[PDB]
mmCIF file of all heavy atoms in Angstrom:
data_model
loop_
_atom_site.group_PDB
_atom_site.id
_atom_site.type_symbol
_atom_site.label_atom_id
_atom_site.label_comp_id
_atom_site.label_asym_id
_atom_site.label_seq_id
_atom_site.Cartn_x
_atom_site.Cartn_y
_atom_site.Cartn_z
ATOM 1 N N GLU A 136 0.554 -7.000 -8.407
ATOM 2 C CA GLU A 136 0.116 -7.066 -7.016
ATOM 3 C C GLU A 136 0.848 -6.046 -6.145
ATOM 4 O O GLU A 136 0.226 -5.372 -5.309
ATOM 5 C CB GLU A 136 0.316 -8.478 -6.473
ATOM 6 C CG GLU A 136 -0.187 -8.672 -5.057
ATOM 7 C CD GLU A 136 -0.079 -10.112 -4.601
ATOM 8 O OE1 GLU A 136 0.386 -10.954 -5.397
ATOM 9 O OE2 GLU A 136 -0.450 -10.403 -3.445
ATOM 10 N N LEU A 140 -0.892 -2.814 -4.193
ATOM 11 C CA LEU A 140 -0.772 -2.631 -2.746
ATOM 12 C C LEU A 140 -0.124 -1.293 -2.403
ATOM 13 O O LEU A 140 -0.501 -0.643 -1.417
ATOM 14 C CB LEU A 140 0.013 -3.783 -2.125
ATOM 15 C CG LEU A 140 -0.709 -5.125 -2.119
ATOM 16 C CD1 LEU A 140 0.201 -6.214 -1.576
ATOM 17 C CD2 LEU A 140 -1.983 -5.031 -1.305
ATOM 18 N N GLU A 143 -2.721 1.345 -2.909
ATOM 19 C CA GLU A 143 -3.713 1.281 -1.843
ATOM 20 C C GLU A 143 -3.184 1.888 -0.546
ATOM 21 O O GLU A 143 -3.927 2.564 0.177
ATOM 22 C CB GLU A 143 -4.157 -0.163 -1.627
ATOM 23 C CG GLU A 143 -5.292 -0.329 -0.635
ATOM 24 C CD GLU A 143 -5.751 -1.769 -0.506
ATOM 25 O OE1 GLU A 143 -5.166 -2.645 -1.178
ATOM 26 O OE2 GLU A 143 -6.698 -2.026 0.267
ATOM 27 N N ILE A 144 -1.898 1.685 -0.242
ATOM 28 C CA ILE A 144 -1.383 2.280 0.990
ATOM 29 C C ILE A 144 -1.180 3.787 0.825
ATOM 30 O O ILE A 144 -1.394 4.551 1.779
ATOM 31 C CB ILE A 144 -0.109 1.548 1.481
ATOM 32 C CG1 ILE A 144 0.259 1.997 2.894
ATOM 33 C CG2 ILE A 144 1.077 1.743 0.563
ATOM 34 C CD1 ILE A 144 1.313 1.150 3.526
ATOM 35 N N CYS A 147 -4.521 5.071 1.542
ATOM 36 C CA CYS A 147 -4.931 4.971 2.938
ATOM 37 C C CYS A 147 -4.069 5.786 3.897
ATOM 38 O O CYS A 147 -4.393 5.842 5.088
ATOM 39 C CB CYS A 147 -4.936 3.505 3.382
ATOM 40 S SG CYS A 147 -6.218 2.499 2.598
ATOM 41 N N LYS B 103 2.040 -5.272 3.240
ATOM 42 C CA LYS B 103 0.918 -5.771 4.039
ATOM 43 C C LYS B 103 1.032 -5.336 5.497
ATOM 44 O O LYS B 103 0.050 -4.875 6.096
ATOM 45 C CB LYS B 103 0.829 -7.297 3.953
ATOM 46 C CG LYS B 103 0.277 -7.841 2.648
ATOM 47 C CD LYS B 103 0.169 -9.357 2.718
ATOM 48 C CE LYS B 103 -0.348 -9.957 1.423
ATOM 49 N NZ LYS B 103 -1.780 -9.627 1.188
ATOM 50 N N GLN B 105 2.774 -2.780 6.725
ATOM 51 C CA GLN B 105 2.646 -1.331 6.817
ATOM 52 C C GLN B 105 1.211 -0.871 6.595
ATOM 53 O O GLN B 105 0.772 0.107 7.206
ATOM 54 C CB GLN B 105 3.583 -0.648 5.824
ATOM 55 C CG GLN B 105 5.051 -0.731 6.180
ATOM 56 C CD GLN B 105 5.922 -0.027 5.167
ATOM 57 O OE1 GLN B 105 5.432 0.483 4.156
ATOM 58 N NE2 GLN B 105 7.226 0.008 5.423
ATOM 59 N N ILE B 106 0.443 -1.580 5.758
ATOM 60 C CA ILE B 106 -0.922 -1.120 5.534
ATOM 61 C C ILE B 106 -1.822 -1.523 6.701
ATOM 62 O O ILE B 106 -2.773 -0.798 7.025
ATOM 63 C CB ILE B 106 -1.455 -1.595 4.164
ATOM 64 C CG1 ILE B 106 -2.680 -0.778 3.753
ATOM 65 C CG2 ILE B 106 -1.837 -3.066 4.150
ATOM 66 C CD1 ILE B 106 -3.041 -0.927 2.299
ATOM 67 N N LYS B 110 -3.927 1.352 8.725
ATOM 68 C CA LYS B 110 -5.360 1.366 9.012
ATOM 69 C C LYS B 110 -5.622 1.445 10.517
ATOM 70 O O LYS B 110 -6.612 2.055 10.946
ATOM 71 C CB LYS B 110 -6.047 0.143 8.399
ATOM 72 C CG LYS B 110 -5.867 0.033 6.890
ATOM 73 C CD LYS B 110 -6.407 1.230 6.125
ATOM 74 C CE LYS B 110 -7.912 1.210 6.036
ATOM 75 N NZ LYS B 110 -8.383 0.052 5.229
ATOM 76 N N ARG B 113 -5.208 5.039 11.338
ATOM 77 C CA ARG B 113 -6.376 5.761 10.836
ATOM 78 C C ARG B 113 -7.578 5.617 11.769
ATOM 79 O O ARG B 113 -8.311 6.589 12.000
ATOM 80 C CB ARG B 113 -6.730 5.270 9.434
ATOM 81 C CG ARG B 113 -7.851 6.042 8.774
ATOM 82 C CD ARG B 113 -8.125 5.530 7.376
ATOM 83 N NE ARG B 113 -9.211 6.260 6.734
ATOM 84 C CZ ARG B 113 -9.665 6.001 5.514
ATOM 85 N NH1 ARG B 113 -9.130 5.022 4.798
ATOM 86 N NH2 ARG B 113 -10.657 6.720 5.009
#
Side-chain angles (χ1 to χ4, degrees):
Chain A
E136 184 175 0
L140 290 176
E143 186 177 1
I144 191 169
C147 292
Chain B
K103 285 183 181 291
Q105 289 181 357
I106 197 165
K110 302 301 284 295
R113 185 178 180 181

